[PDB]
Amino acid sequence: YEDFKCTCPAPHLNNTNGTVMKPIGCYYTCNVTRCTAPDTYPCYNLTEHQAKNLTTSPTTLCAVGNCDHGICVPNGTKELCFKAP
Amino acid sequence: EDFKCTCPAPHLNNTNGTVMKPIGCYYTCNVTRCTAPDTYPCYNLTEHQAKNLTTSPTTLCAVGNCDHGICVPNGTKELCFKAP
Amino acid sequence: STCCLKYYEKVLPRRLVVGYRKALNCHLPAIIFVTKRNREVCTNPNDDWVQEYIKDPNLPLLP
Amino acid sequence: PSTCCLKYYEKVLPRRLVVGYRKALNCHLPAIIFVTKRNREVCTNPNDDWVQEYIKDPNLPLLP
């Protein structure tokens, strides 16, 4: 069944807003197949500094955006991100 | 409720061997008003051309793509007509 | 002279379908199943249930 | 719980294939995640009736 190609969960980050969880990008991997987030789906757009130095504590200010053609287009709003344990 | 927007919609024909394209981006299933998928190809007609549309290839239709339910013309043109 | 804009992704119980049509000169080529209540249901022609349904000789193509 | 779903599995999953489920509701697409025999996580819409009848089953447990 090729219907399971992109029906797998994807890693998401937590926040401190009380808002929905948002991924690091618009692309996610299931098995070996590359999947893309739905268009306008909310996401974080981070720099490489914030990505390699991201921790489990609310310490990073992330640019929030929406998915367009697989790209996280920032919308100007910001949030505190951390990886869930 | 899984049948909300899975019904076929009326589409127009051409003479250049391309896919069939509907009038606008909106179609109705039973009582539900449905919208075409994004980028879906369509015709953008004037009110004049809509009333003067016939079963004969006589009207030059503007071709476009669906964005938020709107047929945004892309600049290309075709002859459209209603099938008998 | 009709085209489909959204696919029915679930499996349609055979007891509901009485026939089928083909709409392939469309941006979304589809096999259109006709149900007992005269409902036309758009399906993907590459799905296996759609293909196994069309192979049924008691499930006819309708002009 | 740190995962969210981006596409729903719209077909019906045979019960004999599923071993458990998880919930991912603080997401833009709230989903019930069924775990299958081969450890596959399958995203489903929580409002679907088949998904809900599966969760009501006491022999189909929520997985930590």
Numbering used by the authors:
A (entry chain A): 20 to 104
B (entry chain B): 21 to 104
C (entry chain D): 15 to 77
D (entry chain C): 14 to 77
What does the paper say about this structure?
In particular, evasins (designated by the prefix “EVA”) are produced in the saliva of ticks and bind to chemokines, thus preventing chemokine receptor activation and the downstream inflammatory cascade (Bhusal et al., 2020). Evasins belonging to class A bind exclusively to CC chemokines, whereas those belonging to class B bind exclusively to CXC chemokines. We recently described class A3 evasins, which have 10 cysteines and an additional disulfide, and reported chemokine‐bound structures of the class A3 evasin EVA‐AAM1001 (Devkota et al., 2023).
The complex crystallized in 1:1 stoichiometry with two molecules per asymmetric unit. In both complexes, the extreme N‐ and C‐termini of both EVA‐ACA1001 and CCL16 were not clearly visible in the electron density maps, consistent with the minimal contributions of these regions to binding. EVA‐ACA1001 comprises one β‐strand forming an anti‐parallel beta sheet with the CC motif of CCL16, two antiparallel β‐sheets, and two α‐ helices. As expected, the structure contains five intramolecular disulfide bonds, four (Cys27‐Cys49, Cys45‐Cys86, Cys62‐Cys91, and Cys81‐Cys100) of which are conserved in all class A evasins, and the fifth (Cys25‐Cys54) that is unique to class A3 evasins. EVA‐ACA1001 interacts with the chemokine CC motif, the residue immediately following the CC motif (“CC + 1” residue), and a shallow groove between the N‐loop and the third β‐strand (β3). The CC motif of CCL16 interacts with EVA‐ACA1001 through four backbone‐backbone hydrogen bonds. The hydrophobic pocket is defined by the side chains of Cys27, Ala29, Pro30, His31, Pro42, Tyr47, Cys49, Pro57, and Tyr60 and by the Cys25–Cys54 disulfide bond, the unique disulfide in class A3 evasins. Notably, His31, Pro42, and Tyr60 form a hydrophobic cluster at the base of the hydrophobic pocket, which differs from the equivalent region of EVA‐AAM1001 and may contribute to the broader spectrum of chemokine binding by EVA‐ACA1001 (see Discussion).
